[PDB]
Design a protein around this ligand. Structure first.
Ligand code: CLR
Ligand code: CLR
Ligand code: CLR
Ligand code: CLR
Ligand code: CLR
Ligand code: CLR
Ligand code: HNO
Lengths: 338, 56, 282, 126, 235
């Protein structure tokens, strides 16, 4: 019964591929030929937030566009002030190997997760001023690779368990588990309406999840190596992926296939972080070649370069108003660009 | 054993197949339309003047 | 001719000091302007560069100050307008600054050696505190024997701008600590070379031509030029000695600058980043 | 879609010869290191033989050296395993796998229990 | 007023930076060790003696120096991604079960995972302390001669014991081949890539061996010393 069901799977995959090709009547490289290029995006480091002792693995902006959280392998969860390069909180973690961190859109809480298979929620706006663990969301049998705060006490955590999860922080038990990925789920990106999220894994595939229902609404193939980063288009109708393939692909939730491929022949290094600008016109991609490239999200041309990091660029982040681009790296320095 | 894995994968494939897909041309037009509509509010696409640049 | 020998020496040693000063201020600017080279060993390197620069400028003054005065005395059989300054402590103090720059150079070579040795031997140390201790040693322990030497020359001795160490026992006040610095630098040098050859033997063909480069890079840094000269004449032999005792200590600033800020692999790396950054601008 | 379907297996008598063709599709074949793994009955995934991007550096598991040989055709995007002088211990489902990242000498997790870029395997019974 | 709140920000920053200095003095003082191994590779015993005799986290202290050992547990077998977390680690302690059988070539499985650690472009400066465990269970296997490594490694029969051999009392020539042949299968990978950046220090241990806590301390001194000696280009 296995061979016949494998036959069913292969013919249904071929049917989906033909239905995608029937929808593939053009590309952005043909429609955006009448689109003027953005020129050279020459962004300069405005601030260098230093104080971290080890590699900076994660970084996330607050909704106010002032406060960052940066997670580093030394066991620190530092809250920065991006305008005055001042540290607001230095949260020591129980596990030094923190692989992700998130800043709650309400500003009250901050998460972090790594090799301890636990997503720890810290309460910043506490009655005594002591930044203390609020919850420890245990239950994953794999390392925590990316956790994103949903609004109403919910958090979408992605693990190396090949399984995502939506946790109810107040109780501490996950209400939904998103399964279907065969490789380590590496990165998340919540849509602007926080009703759908997309997951990147080491299966070279991206999956569109319904966070309220728990089903994989859509599986995006086309990448060739481990999806290391994922990010939504600002309108929530498209998303960009970065992999070890050394290319960025732009999938559309409606077109159900690739829109653009962001690659360069002199680029052979894996892409660790991907972001978008407020208009979604600039695709910021962090690389292993120690610099970020400012891709034209509509033309696949390298409009600029954010160079100046002495090690691998591990985490990118655009402010919610788009006023700056933060780039954390394994050199323990988080640089703000504009 | 693996029968559950195969049945889950095929039900996921049929759940993913019966969706209202759109031509890539219309999605491209909508994407470039959003990029054209919100170009004025992009301080990375258009360099914001230093008078209202908090990172100066 | 003795005159020839002497003038074929001092100008070259200033040339040595001039090249050391030029390459060394370039090296100090390089170590300061990249940020990525900012470590604690590079702070010790910047202090050693500054102290070598201090001794270079100090010998420039010494040879120039004396010359200004000499020019005036011989300008017109003057003799006067020259004697007064020697009695004015305006040259006693500049010679004290000279002896302090010399002592600070030797003791910053000592601090470089001690830091390298404890980096190889005692790897549990707070680089925030130990660097303050090393700065305090390199810049302050020279005071603790140069300024008592100054007060001894002021109280006990006569004039001569303190350039005549006639009572050598009083000159031991600054000689011995410098010989102590050189002896401890030599002990640290032999230990570090023993450690390097132990790491080479434990590896996998000919360790001699690599230990040669390691030792030739370590000689100027710890300042082991002096262990043959200082620790110790015949008119041929004395001439042979002073020439090397001046030329090697004059060019060791250039040698340290090159070997630890120019052919250093990280700065050749460091440059290649800043330069590229500047390039993309264009 | 990284697709790795394989053919050429089947039943052979001890001492025979077999050639498994690994038709790779969906990733530029010349960019990434390739290898064969096999899962003998008894629940064990073992690596068989490595081959670099250009095909210059070829390694083998000790039990198959000198008797197994692999080539790669970067033009047709195919990998071969010529299996000479087979033994009854060689009964296994042979999976054609590629390492996770191009331009890397490291070959991670090809023998993992649930690797993603590993083929569906062909059964070779001796 | 904003002056007082901005100076309170400065004062909080000062407190935070003082705490970060006090925490960095402990960070760069403790040595981080990633403890890897295969399935039942005997590394569990190595955990026990380093824990009691003076992922999961192990802090021990030998010769007043603090060490942190991180046994990666409750993780999958796809070490592709989380092994990038271990670059600041001074030493990856690799425990290999030299006599895992008497499932399917656990030595070649460990050899290929060993090959992927060096060639990992992020572990291209992390040294590997190699504990070839179960040297006592490898003894009874080869001297009996019913289960060979020659069927898993044909180049073993053509392999003669190296001149750098230091056999323990009771190590007949039949075992010091298998003892040292395995060691050179790992050193064939340790020398064919990355010279001067990372170094392999292979060791022969067992469940009865107790000074394994000093072999890591002696070779973590060697790792740090070689890291310093190449900062001055003395090595
Ligand atoms: C590039 C710029 C900023 C660096 C300038 C460094 C200058 C001050 C260096 C370079 C060459 C040096 C001069 C060369 C040699 C002499 C002759 C000596 O009898 C008096 C000092 C004097 C005149 C030196 C003073 C310092 C010096 C002038
Ligand atoms: C030699 C004396 C005069 C010192 C003053 C000249 C200085 C500025 C010269 C001498 C050696 C030079 C270096 C030689 C080596 C390299 C490697 C190259 O890939 C980048 C430039 C770099 C790093 C050069 C920078 C400039 C340099 C430091
Ligand atoms: C500034 C010039 C004109 C005279 C000062 C001497 C300069 C060349 C030397 C002497 C002592 C040196 C300083 C010694 C220690 C420090 C503190 C350290 O955290 C930053 C580097 C810094 C600040 C060095 C900078 C260079 C330095 C200031
Ligand atoms: C004639 C003039 C230029 C001589 C000036 C000598 C100056 C530059 C020397 C003398 C005292 C030295 C300082 C002594 C103490 C410190 C504090 C230390 O944390 C950084 C280095 C620093 C700041 C030194 C810098 C260089 C220094 C300031
Ligand atoms: C004229 C003499 C006194 C000075 C000449 C420089 C000498 C001292 C230098 C040149 C070569 C060096 C030696 C070469 C390497 C070794 C082997 C090591 O296991 C002990 C130190 C030792 C022995 C070094 C000591 C210092 C050394 C002997
Ligand atoms: C002109 C001199 C005094 C200055 C340089 C110091 C001399 C003495 C140093 C520099 C290089 C050194 C050599 C480096 C190489 C080795 C190989 C080692 O296995 C034996 C010692 C030997 C042969 C050293 C002898 C001492 C040596 C020649
Ligand atoms: C290499 N080998 C030797 C051998 C000997 Cl006997 C002497 Cl004196 C010097 C040597 N130098 C080197 N390498 C250099 C330092 C790069 C020339």
């Amino acid at each position: 019964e296995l061979d016949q069901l494998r036959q069913e799977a292969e013919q249904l995959k071929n049917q989906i591929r033909d239905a995608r090709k029937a929808c593939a009547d053009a590309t952005l490289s043909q429609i955006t030929n009448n689109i003027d290029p953005v020129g050279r995006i020459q962004m300069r480091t405005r601030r260098t937030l230093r104080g971290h002792l080890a590699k900076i693995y994660a970084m996330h902006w607050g909704t106010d566009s002032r406060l960052l959280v940066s997670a580093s392998q030394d066991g620190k969860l530092i809250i920065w002030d991006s305008y005055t390069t001042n540290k607001v909180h230095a949260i020591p973690l129980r596990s030094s190997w923190v692989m992700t961190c998130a800043y709650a859109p309400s500003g009250n809480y901050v998460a972090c997760g790594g090799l301890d298979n636990i997503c720890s929620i810290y309460n910043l706006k506490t009655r005594e001023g002591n930044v203390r663990v609020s919850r420890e969301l245990a239950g994953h049998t794999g390392y925590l690779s990316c956790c994103r705060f949903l609004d109403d006490n919910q958090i979408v955590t992605s693990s190396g368990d090949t399984t995502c999860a939506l946790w109810d922080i107040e109780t501490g038990q996950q209400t939904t588990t998103f399964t279907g990925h065969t490789g380590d789920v590496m990165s998340l990106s919540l849509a602007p309406d926080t009703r759908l999220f997309v997951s990147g894994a080491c299966d070279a595939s991206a999956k569109l999840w319904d966070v309220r229902e728990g089903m994989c609404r859509q599986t995006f193939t086309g990448h060739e190596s481990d999806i290391n980063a994922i990010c939504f288009f600002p309108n929530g109708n498209a998303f960009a992926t970065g992999s070890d393939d050394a290319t960025c692909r732009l999938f559309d939730l409606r077109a159900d296939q690739e829109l653009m491929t962001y690659s360069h022949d002199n680029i052979i290094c894996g892409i660790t972080s991907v972001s978008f600008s407020k208009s979604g016109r600039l695709l910021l991609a962090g690389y292993d070649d120690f610099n970020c490239n400012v891709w034209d999200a509509l033309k696949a041309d390298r409009a600029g370069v954010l160079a100046g990091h002495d090690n691998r660029v591990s985490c990118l982040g655009v402010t919610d108003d788009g006023m700056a681009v933060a780039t954390g790296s394994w050199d323990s320095f988080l640089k703000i660009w504009n | 054993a693996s029968i559950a894995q195969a049945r889950k994968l095929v039900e996921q494939l049929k759940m993913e197949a019966n969706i209202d897909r759109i031509k890539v041309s219309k999605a491209a037009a909508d994407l470039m339309a959003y990029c054209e509509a919100h170009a004025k509010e992009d301080p990375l696409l258009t360099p914001v003047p230093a008078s209202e640049n908090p990172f100066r | 001719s003795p005159e020839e020998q002497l003038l074929f020496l001092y100008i070259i040693y200033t040339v040595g000091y001039a090249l050391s000063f030029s390459a060394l201020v370039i090296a100090s600017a390089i170590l300061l302007g990249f940020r990525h080279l900012h470590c604690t060993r590079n702070y010790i390197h910047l202090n050693l560069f500054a102290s070598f620069i201090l001794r270079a400028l100090s010998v420039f003054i010494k040879d120039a100050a004396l010359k200004w005065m000499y020019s005036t005395a011989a300008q017109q059989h003057q003799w006067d307008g020259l004697l007064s300054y020697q009695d004015s402590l305006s040259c006693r103090l500049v010679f004290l600054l000279m002896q302090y720059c010399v002592a600070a150079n030797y003791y910053w070579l000592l601090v470089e050696g001690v830091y390298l040795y404890t980096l190889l031997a005692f790897s549990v140390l707070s680089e925030q505190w130990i660097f303050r201790l090393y700065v305090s040693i390199g810049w302050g322990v020279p005071l603790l024997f140069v300024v008592p030497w100054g007060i001894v020359k002021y109280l006990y001795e006569d004039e001569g701008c303190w350039t005549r160490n006639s009572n050598m026992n009083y000159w031991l006040i600054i000689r011995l600590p410098i010989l102590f610095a050189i002896g401890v630098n030599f002990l640290i040098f032999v230990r570090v070379i023993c450690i390097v050859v132990s790491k080479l033997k434990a590896n996998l063909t000919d360790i001699k031509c690599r230990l040669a480069k390691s030792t030739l890079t370590l000689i100027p840094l710890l300042g082991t030029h002096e262990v043959i000269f200082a620790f110790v004449a015949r008119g041929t032999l004395r001439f042979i000695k002073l020439f090397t005792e001046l030329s090697f200590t004059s060019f060791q600033g250039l040698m340290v600058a090159i070997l630890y800020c120019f052919v250093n692999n990280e700065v050749q790396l460091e440059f290649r980043k800043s330069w590229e950054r500047w390039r993309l601008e264009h | 879609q990284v697709q790795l379907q394989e053919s050429g297996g089947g039943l052979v008598q001890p001492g025979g010869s077999l050639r498994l063709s690994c038709a790779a599709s969906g990733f530029t074949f010349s960019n990434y290191k390739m290898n064969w793994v096999r899962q003998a009955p008894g629940k064990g995934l073992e690596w068989v033989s490595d081959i670099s991007q250009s095909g210059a550096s070829i390694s083998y598991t000790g039990s198959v050296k000198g008797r197994f040989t692999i080539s790669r055709d970067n033009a047709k995007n195919t990998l071969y395993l010529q299996m000479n002088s087979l033994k009854p211990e060689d009964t296994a489902v042979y999976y054609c796998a590629r390492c996770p990242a191009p331009f890397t000498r490291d070959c991670f997790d090809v023998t993992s229990t649930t690797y993603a870029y590993r083929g569906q395997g062909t059964q070779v019974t001796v | 007023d904003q002056r007082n709140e901005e100076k309170a920000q400065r004062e909080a920053n000062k407190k935070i930076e003082k705490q970060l200095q006090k925490d960095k003095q402990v960070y760069r003082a403790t040595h981080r060790l990633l403890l890897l191994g295969a399935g039942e590779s005997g590394k569990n015993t190595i955990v026990k003696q380093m824990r009691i005799l003076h992922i999961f986290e192990t802090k021990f202290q030998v010769d007043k120096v603090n060490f942190h050992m991180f046994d990666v547990g409750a993780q999958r077998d796809e070490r592709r991604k989380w092994i990038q977390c271990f670059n600041d680690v001074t030493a990856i302690i690799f425990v290999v079960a030299s006599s895992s059988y008497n499932q399917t070539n656990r030595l070649q499985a460990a050899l290929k995972l060993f090959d992927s650690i060096w060639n990992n472009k992020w572990l291209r400066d992390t040294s590997v302390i190699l504990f070839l465990n179960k040297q006592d269970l490898l003894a009874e296997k080869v001297l009996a001669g019913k289960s060979k490594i020659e069927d898993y490694f044909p180049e073993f029969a053509r392999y003669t014991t190296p001149e750098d051999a230091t056999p323990e009392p009771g190590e007949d020539p039949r075992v010091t081949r298998a003892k040292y042949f395995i060691r050179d299968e790992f050193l064939r990978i340790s020398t064919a890539s990355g010279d001067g950046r990372h170094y392999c220090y292979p060791h022969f241990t067992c469940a009865v061996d107790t000074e394994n806590i000093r072999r890591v301390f002696n070779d973590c001194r060697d790792i740090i010393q070689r890291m310093h000696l190449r900062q001055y280009e003395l090595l």
